[PDB]
Write a protein that binds this DNA or RNA. Structure first.
Ligand SMILES: [Zn+2]
Ligand SMILES: [Zn+2]
Lengths: 522, 424, 424, 485
RNA sequence: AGUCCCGUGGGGUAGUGGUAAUCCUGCUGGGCUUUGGACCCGGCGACAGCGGUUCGACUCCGCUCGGGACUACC
RNA sequence: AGUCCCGUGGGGUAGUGGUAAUCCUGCUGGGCUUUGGACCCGGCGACAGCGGUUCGACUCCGCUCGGGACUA
């Protein structure tokens, strides 16, 4: 799709958990817990004039704490402890593995964040490496920055009295790797994302769910920056990019037509309720009140498929769905939906709409339908301008969906509590000359030097047990058996624990096949 | 405040803080603003603030700067009158996100900018008398504050809030209790969490102190969070508060008493029902204090010499922080007696904090009494210290000082000890 | 021990204590036993013990006396052996209602007579090493105890209980923690209420301590009432306990930790689950201690001179009890530095007691850190003091000492501080 | 009944509450509280069996955050002597012509009763060798003590008794008199006198306030203390009635020996003997047991005291442990039971016609524990009269309660300092004693034109210090009375 | 993308790492059918596919083809 | 000893600081009883006792005595 011609500029931001014994600026363990919180702490973050009454109300948070799994650090009741060395070491290694240039002195900062996921109103982050690069068929891609930050608390519930986060994840080490913001080749983006992943898997990193997080930033000339969050599957990056390029192009064509016919967006909301006194659609008939708005010249464009399956109206529907509401009804799709033309003509008439423009109605309770229509007008206005910068999420297919605006520029100042960390070049080399082998290397090396088949070696690496590992037996017991135990047991007891002992007692009394039962007891 | 090699390296290119510079290394090349470097830190490194927002430290041993741009230096009545005095405590502020540096802010305006809620509580007046870190505070400044509060309160103020630092806050409140007599409330406050933080407890602490400064409780008090939650504040009687934790928002607890009240930016709850009402007293100011007072914590091994060196140094009084019930090693007797022969008052308090001293129960105690020691009932040690300073500034008659120490004057002594005064 | 006039005319008739006499005066005439008269009391009077049982004082300025009469276990095994040592603390006794005077009693059988219940817990062995009032305790006796215990535990004792005085108990336990390594429990105990009383806590405390002494927890500890109720006892980890109240039965509270267990004459409930098990340890004893260590509580006004005086006196170490977070007046910096220039270690701890020090947060702290002060995490001031004594007793290398202070040797320091650690 | 010949020795023990601002060795106020206690303290006192004695020492104390302090709980050492207390204590002392001590010393009266939280009572002698005058002669007042009142009970559960600490510590004055009076008429005279003097000082007026206990003695008789003798005018009677009971029992003993009576602790389940009886009481009774007392016949019903018999005493000892009233040979021929039945019990229990039977119709479990007591008392009958603690009944008689109090063992309360009674401040009262009510009455009358009734009431209500005169009074002595309406 | 289940004669239905698979149904030799069926002997015909571990794998581990359940920005 | 009620014609029952008390019923005059019952107009007959307070107290205060309740 002539990428370099539409001016496609992509970027990648990868966050990775570390799997260190202790958290970053505190000593608590790096694992989450399902246990019931020992203490719920009520707090309120603070801004910076008629809203300093509504804004505040949206900053009331409840923090779940644990007498064991949490400390005063997570609660903002005790200053952060000094930078966790183990973390910085992995961070550095990773950086070096990316050909980055590790900093001479590490300085912790406070990225302003009144989101609630942070108990202090900020996130502690620090820059560790810079100007790095990778190698891809498509060419050499530069890696801009490498930062070590605390992961945020996690959300648990939302109630009248605001959001409720849990502090267990708060503090777990993280590395934010950003790449050049102007990629240009979809296939290249997937290559970088993949290589980065394989590098991260080359160091002490958490493996599992929440673990990694990848956010791509697609862009197009005369289009707009849009962040796509949570793209679990890398194989699908090409696809979601291409599909995004289409959506911005479609949205652009729609911009040019709205201008072709000098469309206008009137924030005038009409109480088109009497028009449905006797209607044939339960949805509305059972709806409290019902309002509608006109979009001049917008006809025929709210239903145009901008992306395989979704239409502009869908975008509007998504913009409007916030503030509550099922799904907006509109001219280009309303001839149906259990409503006859005599009715369709009734709306156009009551709203005073020409045959060239269209109407978007909302059947709900007046108080909100008003707030909802105000949004479909906001987006309507944006369509006149074109593609709007927003944070979307990826769907099962390659499409995406609106979530919220784009992140504001990250305001951040000094975290005076934590000392500076000088990275003595001496210890920096004791690493750069001992970087870890990639997974691929691990597999072949381990194969080549133990007779392990590709399969057994593949699994042993996949499960991170290569370090533990008749050879073909000791492996077939951690790559095969131990997985079978995650179905009838709690093998998460101690690798090297019972294993040490039992593995010995296989040299004397205890047939190969006894293993998958002996250790089990433990 | 760079030093050595750094400054030398940074000067030789005529570069100062704020200056956008470009540093080149054999394998790197940064571009950012130069930031002042903490003195604690040692040279060889230059702090730069990269475009992305992060501060970095770069080794100059083999650098090379180039300036790219020089720095840049851009009353409704019907509501009570409350003065917000800052002694050095910062309960509100503003940050310059272009330096990363946080800057205080104690103005009737600034405070309002940060705590609008105030406008419905009272009419703010907030100058900044002076400024000393709570840690570096001394007797001299107790007075200086008592004098400062006396003013505001004399110039027509329905209440006065003193923005003090946490560390010593209780000592100070003690002082103000003995040196001030008031018709209006005087509430000390501060924050455990820097005010620049969005989580800072400064906000609730201030507009709850302001709220209290309105109340009918006219005594010198301390108002801080009552828990780790941002919901209430406890109004603590001045001569019965003590910072019991090094970091928790709820560090201040009432010791040999219970919180006098429970404040909110909306109202008070007055739990204690026996206190100095509003008008009832008339503004007097006993600003006389004897800067010289020993305050010696007893402990196993302590030497009489320490006590002696104090008498020799012309110390007018000694406040010993003994072992449970009001004790201290027998080897100290001679010295403590000697102090008496020298007309130097010696009072006893317990390290336990929670409790009432009774030097009558055991022999060690009785002999200590025999040597002229003054039991201080259930007065918190630091208060007994603060008091001696005041009392010995009110007279030089040993005998009288001993009388005034035992004399309950502001609430430092409580005749009886309730089961409710020792939760855990 | 009568004095002056009293003795004069009590002598001039050849009468001693215990003798039944008959005193006659112009308006009265008593007949009772003469009783010893505490020294604190002044002469002029003679303590008689009337026939009814009531002791009374009679002014002899116009008296006249006349003598009327001169004065006058098993070992069933199958039960753990526990040694009960007494350092001066009395946890059981007998009263002679013929004098009104109570006298101690610390024999494997006396305890048994007053605490039969023990017979089913373990086999009692109770010598009485030495005797010093908890008030008058000193570092040399920490050792003497350290030695005493090591003995019993060496002569085959499944557990050892030391009957210590309350006042300074926590200091000592702290000491034995550092000085001793143990295969069996070593539990300190005592009574806030004299053992002579029928209500003394001594009973439940002693037979809970013994219970504990049998438990699997093998480290130096303190076992005392957990509430004012006579039901349970908390087993406190020695390097984390403090006498928090002047008199209450539940005076001893775990500070920057929770109680290790819940003891009862019948069993223990081990709340904490991470502790030095039984056999795991091999009896070692580092009884060396540097008896000269400064322990100065910081305060508004403290002068450098005290710190110097200490350096000048040849003090090898200093433990400051600073203001929250670990501060002390800016004015002591120079002295604190000079101390460093002299190879004298200086440790910081907070008066708050509750909490962890972080001399990095504020300037004052950093500057103090710059002068070489050793932050002590969350170690209680008195244990940091007890610790310095031991450490400077194990080396003279300043750097080494700074490393040892910071090193968690017996649980003095907790890496993290749980919310459960600050109830109120 | 010519007392001097029977060898009667009488003694008076009176305790008065002082009504001072704060308690004795504590600051807490001097009034009780009915409000719900804020804290229940669980405790155990200790002896000095050690498995069942202990269980009888479990105590729960009710505390108040305000009307109670740590001293009451035994969680804080006794503050020093309450000056105001020692003041009135002395005043009363001087008023009784006693010799105020030179140095007051607080003692610890051993008291493992539960009434106090420490395991003892704080008492101190203030005066001695005092005297009063009655028409029958001059009577001596031995000692005057200032002690702390005890805690008051409130409940008894399976986990022991429950005390409230509000009364504990209220200042008390124990006034003792010669324990050898001999003239009942004279004892009433001193009891009265004492009363008027106590009522002449700052003293508590009301219910639990006063407490008089006299001890009756009989030559060849026994020591017995009468507890709580509310009405003084009734003293001579209860004494007389007591002496009767002593003499009466000095005979029931000799008869029991004359016939070498024996008490067999053998309890019989004489239930089938009443399969079909004519007495609701038993027929409706769960089970029914009985016991035999050899030779006891004819003496269980002997009137030992005007109106009550030995059996009554037995009924008394048996009453505890639950039970209405024991049935017995000497009173059983009636009670709604025929002799055909009376002969049925004597037979079933195997009793000679010289001995008697004592039956109990109730539930087996208790009737057994009840009969074991009637046996206990029965055996005591063989021995005679025991020194015991009894109470006064509506009329002049008395009733068993518990053994005689143990010798008061006591040592020094070292937590409280001594108090020297400045001879100089002692006369500052010595010559300022308070006027007795009698004197107040007259004086007010004499100088206020107040009628006797008016001055009487004013004094009776202690408003004299408060008070057209006749009106100022008539609205303090009359209307403020309607106030409590 | 993550967790996870199902895939057994021609039709359905059980159950299993082993010297290998249950009935009903289908189809067929004989017996008894006083040249139906029913019943009685016996026959035919399955483990989804590739690897890894294994002495041997439908049976344990992984990957495919096939159906599905569930979860997928904080 | 406590505190709270009651203590009213022979018996019962309401009601009260005041120029002081209710009908029921017993007793008894007259009438009718179409010359028994019974109905109908009436009469005799009380507010326990001593005080204080009151211009006058059963009804206010205390105290005797008696009946009743509860509390220790
Ligand atoms: Zn933590
Ligand atoms: Zn009290």
């Amino acid at each position: 799709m002539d990428w370099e011609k539409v001016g496609l500029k992509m970027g990648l931001e990868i966050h990775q958990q570390l799997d260190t014994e202790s958290k970053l600026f505190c000593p608590c363990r790096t694992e989450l817990t399902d246990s019931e919180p020992d203490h719920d702490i009520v707090r309120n973050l603070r801004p910076t004039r008629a809203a300093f009454e509504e804004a505040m109300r949206k900053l009331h948070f409840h923090y779940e704490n644990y007498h064991e799994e949490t400390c005063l650090v997570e609660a903002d009741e005790e200053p952060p402890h000094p930078l966790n060395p183990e973390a910085l070491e992995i961070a550095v290694t990773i950086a070096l593995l990316l050909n980055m240039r590790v900093v001479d002195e590490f300085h912790t900062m406070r990225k302003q964040v009144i989101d609630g996921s942070n108990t202090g109103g900020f996130q502690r982050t620090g820059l560790v490496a810079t100007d790095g690069h990778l190698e891809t068929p498509q060419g050499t891609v530069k890696i801009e920055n490498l930062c070590l930050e605390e992961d945020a608390a996690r959300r648990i519930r939302e109630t009248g009295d605001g959001v409720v986060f849990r502090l267990d994840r708060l503090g777990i080490p993280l590395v934010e790797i950003t790449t050049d913001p102007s990629m240009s080749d979809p296939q290249q983006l997937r290559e970088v994302a993949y290589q980065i992943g394989q590098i991260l898997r080359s160091t002490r990193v958490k493996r599992g769910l929440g673990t990694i997080r990848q956010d791509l930033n697609i862009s197009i000339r005369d289009g707009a920056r849009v962040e796509v969050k949570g793209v679990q599957d890398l194989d699908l990056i090409p696809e979601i990019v291409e599909r995004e390029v289409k959506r911005q192009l479609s949205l652009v064509e729609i911009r040019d037509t709205l201008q072709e016919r000098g469309a206008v967006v009137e924030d005038k909301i009409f109480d088109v309720s009497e028009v449905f006194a006797d209607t044939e659609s339960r949805i509305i008939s059972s709806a409290e009140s019902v309002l509608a708005v006109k979009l001049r010249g917008f006809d025929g464009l709210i239903g145009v498929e901008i992306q395989p399956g979704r239409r502009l109206g869908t975008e509007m529907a998504d913009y409007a769905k916030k503030r509550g509401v099922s799904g907006i009804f509109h001219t280009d799709e309303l001839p149906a939906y259990g409503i006859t033309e005599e009715e369709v003509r009734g709306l156009r008439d009551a709203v005073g709409a020409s045959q060239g423009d269209a109407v978007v109605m909302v059947a709900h309770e007046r108080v909100t339908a008003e707030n909802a229509l105000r949004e479909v007008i906001r987006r309507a206005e944006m369509a006149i301008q074109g593609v709007p910068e927003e944070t979307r999420k990826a769907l099962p297919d390659g499409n995406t969906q609106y979530l919220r605006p784009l992140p504001t520029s990250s305001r951040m100042y000094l975290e005076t509590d934590i000392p500076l960390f000088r990275i003595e070049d001496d210890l920096l080399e004791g690493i750069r000359r001992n970087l870890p082998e990639l997974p691929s290397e691990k597999k072949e090396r381990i194969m080549r030097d133990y007779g392990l088949s590709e399969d057994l070696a593949s699994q042993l690496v996949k499960r991170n047990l290569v370090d533990e590992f008749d050879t073909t037996v000791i492996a077939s017991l951690l790559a095969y058996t131990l997985r079978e135990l995650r179905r009838e047991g709690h093998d998460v007891d101690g690798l090297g624990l019972d294993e040490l002992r039992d593995a010995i007692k296989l040299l004397e009394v205890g047939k190969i096949s006894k293993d998958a039962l002996r250790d089990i007891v433990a | 405040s760079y030093q050595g090699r750094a400054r030398k390296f940074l000067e030789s290119a005529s570069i100062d803080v704020g200056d956008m510079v470009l540093v080149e290394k054999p394998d790197v090349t940064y571009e950012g603003m130069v930031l002042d470097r903490a003195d604690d830190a040692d040279d060889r490194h230059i702090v730069l603030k990269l475009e992305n927002g992060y501060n970095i430290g770069v080794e100059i041993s083999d650098a090379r700067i180039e300036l790219l741009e020089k720095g840049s230096e851009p009353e409704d009545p019907e509501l009570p009158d409350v003065s917000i005095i800052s002694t050095g405590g910062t309960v509100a502020s503003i940050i310059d996100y272009r330096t990363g540096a946080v800057h205080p802010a104690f103005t009737a305006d600034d405070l309002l900018r940060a705590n609008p809620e105030l406008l419905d509580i009272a009419n703010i007046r907030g100058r900044a008398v002076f400024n000393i870190l709570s840690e570096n505070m001394k007797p001299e400044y107790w007075v200086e504050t008592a004098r400062a509060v006396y003013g505001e309160i004399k110039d027509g103020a329905d209440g006065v809030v003193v923005a003090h630092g946490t560390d010593t806050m209780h000592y100070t409140s003690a002082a103000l209790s003995f040196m001030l007599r008031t018709p209006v409330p005087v509430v000390f406050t501060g924050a455990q969490r820097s005010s620049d933080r969005p989580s800072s407890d400064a906000s609730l602490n201030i507009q709850c102190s302001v709220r209290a400064a309105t109340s009918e409780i006219a005594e010198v008090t301390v108002c801080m969070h009552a828990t780790m939650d941002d919901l209430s504040c406890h109004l603590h009687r001045g001569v019965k508060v003590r910072k019991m934790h090094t970091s928790r928002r709820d560090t201040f607890r009432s010791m040999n008493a219970l919180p006098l009240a429970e404040v909110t930016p909306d109202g008070i709850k007055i739990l204690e029902e026996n206190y100095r009402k509003r008008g009832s007293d008339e503004l007097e100011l006993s600003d006389r204090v004897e800067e010289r007072v020993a305050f010696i914590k007893s402990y196993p091994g302590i030497s009489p010499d320490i006590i002696k060196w104090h008498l020799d140094e012309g110390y007018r009084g000694i406040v010993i922080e003994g072992t449970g019930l009001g004790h201290c090693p027998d080897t100290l007797i001679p010295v403590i007696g000697e102090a008496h022969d020298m007309g130097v008052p010696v009072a006893m308090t317990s390290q336990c904090l929670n409790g009432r001293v009774n030097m009558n129960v055991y022999s060690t105690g009785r002999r200590l009494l025999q040597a002229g020691v003054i039991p201080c009932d259930d007065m918190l040690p630091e208060v007994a210290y603060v008091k001696m300073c005041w009392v010995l500034g009110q007279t030089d008659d040993p005998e009288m000082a001993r009388e005034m120490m035992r004399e309950n004057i502001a609430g430092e002594i409580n005749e009886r000890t309730s089961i409710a005064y020792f939760r855990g």
